[PDB]
Amino acid sequence: FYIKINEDEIANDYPLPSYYKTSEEETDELILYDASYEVQSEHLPHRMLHNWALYNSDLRFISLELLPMKQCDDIDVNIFGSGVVTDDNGSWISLNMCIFLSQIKEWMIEFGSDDIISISIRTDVAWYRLGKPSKLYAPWWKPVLKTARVGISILTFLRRLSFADVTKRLSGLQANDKAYISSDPLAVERYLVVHGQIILQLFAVYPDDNVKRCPFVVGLASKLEDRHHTKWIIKKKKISLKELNLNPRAGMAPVASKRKAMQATTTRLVNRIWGEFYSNYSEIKWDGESLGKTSAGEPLYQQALVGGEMVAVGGAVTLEVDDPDEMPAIYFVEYMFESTDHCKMLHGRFLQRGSMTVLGNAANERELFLTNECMTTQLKDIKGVASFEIRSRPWGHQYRKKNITADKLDWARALERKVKDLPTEYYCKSLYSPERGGFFSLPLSDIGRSSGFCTSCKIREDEEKRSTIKLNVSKTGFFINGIEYSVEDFVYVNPDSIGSGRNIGLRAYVVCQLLEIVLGSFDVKVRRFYRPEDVSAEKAYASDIQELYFSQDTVVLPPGALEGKCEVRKKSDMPLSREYPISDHIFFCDEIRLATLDIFAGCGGLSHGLKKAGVSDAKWAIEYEEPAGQAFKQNHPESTVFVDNCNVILRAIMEKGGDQDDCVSTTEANELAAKLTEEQKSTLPLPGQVDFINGGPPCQGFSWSKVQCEMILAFLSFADYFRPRYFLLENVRTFVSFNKGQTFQLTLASLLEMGYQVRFGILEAGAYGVSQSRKRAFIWAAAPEEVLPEWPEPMHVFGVPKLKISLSQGLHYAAVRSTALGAPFRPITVRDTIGDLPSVENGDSRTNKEYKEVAVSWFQKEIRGNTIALTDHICKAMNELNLIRCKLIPTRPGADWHDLPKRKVTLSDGRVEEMIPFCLPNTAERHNGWKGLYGRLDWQGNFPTSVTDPQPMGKVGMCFHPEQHRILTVRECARSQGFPDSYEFAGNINHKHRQIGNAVPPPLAFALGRKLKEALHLKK
């Protein structure tokens, strides 16, 4: 009989589960060898194996101790392996063609000198001496050696004793020794009894016979019986080679891997900026006569002499503040007058330094920014004057060279002005606004008027007047938060003020009608409306998004419970344009289009939304992979899609433009560009024909030699070269936190240096109509003569706190308000998205089908439309074990692998495997019990983060249909993102899943495009 210890006992000494991966094809083991008649355990050939790796059927790394150390027939556990086979040669270990094996039968250890051990593996075909292991399998090999150490040392001590004495004598040795185990006797006893087979074989293999008869070995053999284990039998039968290879990867063609990255081709400006950053950081009198009088009669002047220095409107003065180590502040003066007290007042606006802004250390040293804050002081004492000027340059792609030629010269002067120890001359080009989070354009007509009227002061006074509730003269309305409320209006009330499962139980705005009025010493009495969700979930599922019900409930509230105004219309006259997502606060009860250029196009969700908005038409495109380019061509036939690498399309464009000296490129880029034919070269766009550039580079990760392949430098170079009237950048939420946010600051600095007005924001798509949580970072950029678009207003309640970008000096900016408190419309659940699709079986492959059930939900109605050809309703396939595991998970929400019963299942192939997929170590740092794996969804919940590859092998997460025992299909994943049912995808299932995963929800792009159209309609 043989005693085999279960993996749970030794799991405490082994790391967390990890799965085997490879990229090179292998050959079957049985092919190489003859597989002759039955022979003894010695006649098999002896060879060595390097780079070994052992795993179970699930391709999960397993320990060597799971293999019996003697000959047994009814082996209940099957372990497979891989490596490289070489001719045998004597090589020991003391202290420091690819081939996958068949089922592994046994392992044997032999002892040599005082510190010489050897291990070998026997299969049904031949022996294999053991060598160096793989880098991934190293952690699973350390304990096996460690226990061996525990043996070796104690042997040197045996040269007639009880069992506890050796334990207490071992518990006292210091932790610095290589044989240290633990000081607690219980721990040393447990470890000694849990790895008893290895040291038992070591004792039984020793040349000396006296050690074999020590009571230690028999006592340990007796005590091995108590705990969890299994029992086998021992026999010396002749092994038969008649078998077939049963490796899980008998087929399993290698997955594409090692997609190499190369240096990006850029222009001079962007490369210069990023490289420069990363190389170093990784007697007072008046002048003239009076010009007028203020509102109170104070005469105003325009010029003064202070200590010999000249002060005038448009200059800059310096004050004094505490902490003298800090530099003094700068104030741009607006007007200076004389008061009734025969004193000289002045009014100034603070000019912030770049280093205190969002840019941080990436900001320009000589660039100051106008601020909203302003103050008045006395002209009597001012540290001094400072050189200052407002910079304004013409816009266009034809001035670019000129705009460059001056800059160096300017910088040259600065360098000289730093060499000669002269005061630095500052400048201001834009207006920094942290309260809006952006660098807007200077209102040149409203600054330095010397009239006694200050625009910023009036704005602050109006804002102070705002939020102060005051009654109206007619006693029928009031003014609160800038809103003029009156009788017979419709108002929003917070749900609390009225007496995954992230959004479960979340309510929305309560719509009420003002009844009457009962500083601020009054209250409001209003009526009550009801929502379909207030009845049942079924009623809310099959009802319009804007439906409402009437009730006669009247209630009185303080004026602070109102959030805005809404409109209620009869069910006979609507705007007649069912736009989606909705942007108009309306309920019911009863010639500007610009030529664009899409970079990193993908499938084209963003381009689809922008075109649907009406401000874009995809006249050109750039992609990398064939299936994505084919899909983009299919969906947008009029676009001229370029499939060749983008990093060389820029080189081709520059070469066509005759400025090859202003484009740094690799040697391969020139050869690739020269290989293009004549039609594609003639189709390339030229500067001046592009008025919109959008796209998102794939820069995700956590130094100059590495950040030169981020793929965003090429995007910045494209924007610099073409100089469109508008620019859009999109990336992941964590884009503003890579390398402590250095890349985001650098992108902002480059955009400012080119000359745009930029603004940034983190937007959650779930509040705009989609049913999937997805947060993205967006950057808008506009020309100085245009108007930067405003951020769209979310309309759906979704539970997520305010997503704030961290400014400098403890400041946060939130682009949009958090919609968890309330919103006009309810969120979208799982059943509202993919409920109507017909059921499919596991591993379906029919691309074209026919719809079976009519649309019920508002989302289904708005996303189906009139198409009658179901496309890409296919899902991946599971093997026997995975399908059986899937079938055992209940349909309740929140289910995971914790509900899988503990047992072993024999497959039809002829293998026995454990049902439990993982063996986590007890008393370890396994967060939340590894929940979420093998998990179903919820009908009323929301979709989790979309994975680019939901894989049915190994560690499979929450990607299961709530009812059917399968994985979600391609069409369901597309629908969860808001993609219209008429959209087309190309490639195999993996490529389509990757295409859908990387796509941006079309509704968000439509909202951004609508805001851009509103901005464009206002330039006049």
Ligand SMILES: Nc1ncnc2c1ncn2[C@@H]1O[C@H](CSCC[C@H](N)C(=O)O)[C@@H](O)[C@H]1O
């Ligand atoms: N060097 C490169 N040149 C061109 N395309 C690239 C690229 N590296 C990645 N891509 C492609 O750019 C895309 C990144 S995700 C962009 C998705 C797109 N904005 C949408 O809304 O659908 C992927 O399709 C990726 O394959």
Ligand SMILES: [Zn+2]
């Ligand atoms: Zn002012």
